[PDB]
């Protein structure tokens, strides 16, 4: 019900904020105009708006809605790269979509947060959002993303081993973070997985998946570009959102609300798997 004494300052609290950053470095390292400029419109015009509408509809608290919108403002993740390949989309084009969305995040995420924060806080809006801490993280995470691109081009041979090394490092670190943060916060987790938070964590990826497809069909796209744009919109950077919420924000204001990105990651992965199965069964039995 409460938070542990000296929350966000113990060595066990400072280590967890370091493993998250050491995680995100490889997550954003393993990732390396109508169809491409449409994904940006569907990602920064539909996902942040959905995150702001859902919080108002579900009557979420101010801090929970701010965390929801922060999660809906982060760029697309690397899961869409595999999802588009699994749904006969375009892996090569979905990779440049995600890289371009990540690069546009540095200038669009603070701008969208500033615009949509006025819909949550009316008079007590000052110092609610740490813009300096958000932009520092956003400009620091652009370094692994760029070295990932220049590494594959300069030394393609080693990249096959580096990608496997990163994929095996992130898998164990994910458990090491899910366990460490849970031990750190104690019994305050039941605040980040309330029924309303779980419903917002499940209805958001589905809404993104559907609305990206609908918009891409509205813009008269091909069946491959449409199917990769939808899942590039639906999938987001849960690790980068969690790292931002755990680092830039003060621990006393957010508390256990940085655990929502993982509950969003599991729901987006489950719904992507279900959509892939549905599509493949539809194609096989057509």
């Amino acid at each position, epitope marked *: 019900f*409460t*938070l*542990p004494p*000296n929350f966000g300052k113990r060595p066990t609290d400072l280590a967890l904020s370091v493993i998250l950053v050491f995680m995100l470095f490889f997550i954003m390292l393993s990732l390396g105009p109508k169809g491409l400029a449409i994904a940006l419109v569907a990602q920064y015009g539909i996902m942040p708006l959905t995150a702001f509408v859902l919080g108002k509809v579900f009557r979420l608290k101010n801090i929970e809605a701010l965390a929801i919108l922060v999660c809906g403002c982060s760029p697309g993740g690397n899961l869409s790269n595999v999802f588009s390949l699994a749904m006969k989309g375009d892996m090569n084009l979905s990779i440049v979509m995600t890289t371009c969305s990540t690069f546009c995040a540095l200038g669009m995420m603070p701008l969208l947060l500033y615009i949509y924060s006025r819909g949550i806080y009316d*008079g*007590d809006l*000052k110092d*609610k959002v740490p813009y300096k801490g958000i932009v520092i993280s956003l400009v620091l995470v652009l370094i692994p993303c760029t070295i990932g691109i220049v590494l594959k081009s300069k030394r393609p041979q080693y990249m096959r081993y580096v990608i496997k090394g990163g994929m095996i490092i992130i898998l164990l670190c994910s458990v090491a973070v899910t366990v460490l943060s849970a031990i750190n916060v104690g019994k305050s987790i039941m605040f980040a997985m309330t029924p309303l938070l779980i419903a917002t964590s499940s209805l958001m990826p589905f809404i993104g998946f559907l609305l990206g497809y609908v918009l891409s069909a509205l813009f008269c796209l091909n069946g491959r570009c449409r199917r990769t744009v939808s899942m590039e919109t639906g999938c987001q950077n849960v690790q980068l959102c969690s790292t931002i919420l755990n680092v830039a924000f003060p621990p*006393e*204001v957010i508390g256990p609300l940085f655990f929502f990105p993982l509950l969003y990651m599991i729901f987006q992965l489950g719904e992507g798997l279900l959509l892939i199965a549905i599509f493949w069964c539809y194609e096989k039995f057509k």
Partner: nanobody
Amino acid sequence: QRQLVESGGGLVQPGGSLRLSCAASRFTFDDYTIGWFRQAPGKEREGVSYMSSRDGSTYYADSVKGRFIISRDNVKNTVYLQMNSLEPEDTAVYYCAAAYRPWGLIGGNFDFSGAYWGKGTPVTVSS
């Protein structure tokens, strides 16, 4: 400054009482821990009364315990501080802080880091 406005300060005689206010600019004191401070010429700012406003936890300084009572008005977005039995050494400028704590106090302690601060209202207690 612009988020919190203090009022009620005035000149009172030793033995009288007065009540201050901490009306919020435009918001509610729900996810906040209000706290009244005071700073007299020669000494530094010290707390006199806090409030959790989520569970009712109250802190009272040992120099105002039994005399000062802090309260809240949910229907007016104000926080009061009833100051009874004022003494000559009680004259100072009384400020009011408000720290955004949606989850309450961190365990049991009253924190005020990154809190909105008012401009303060002077209180002169003399004959």
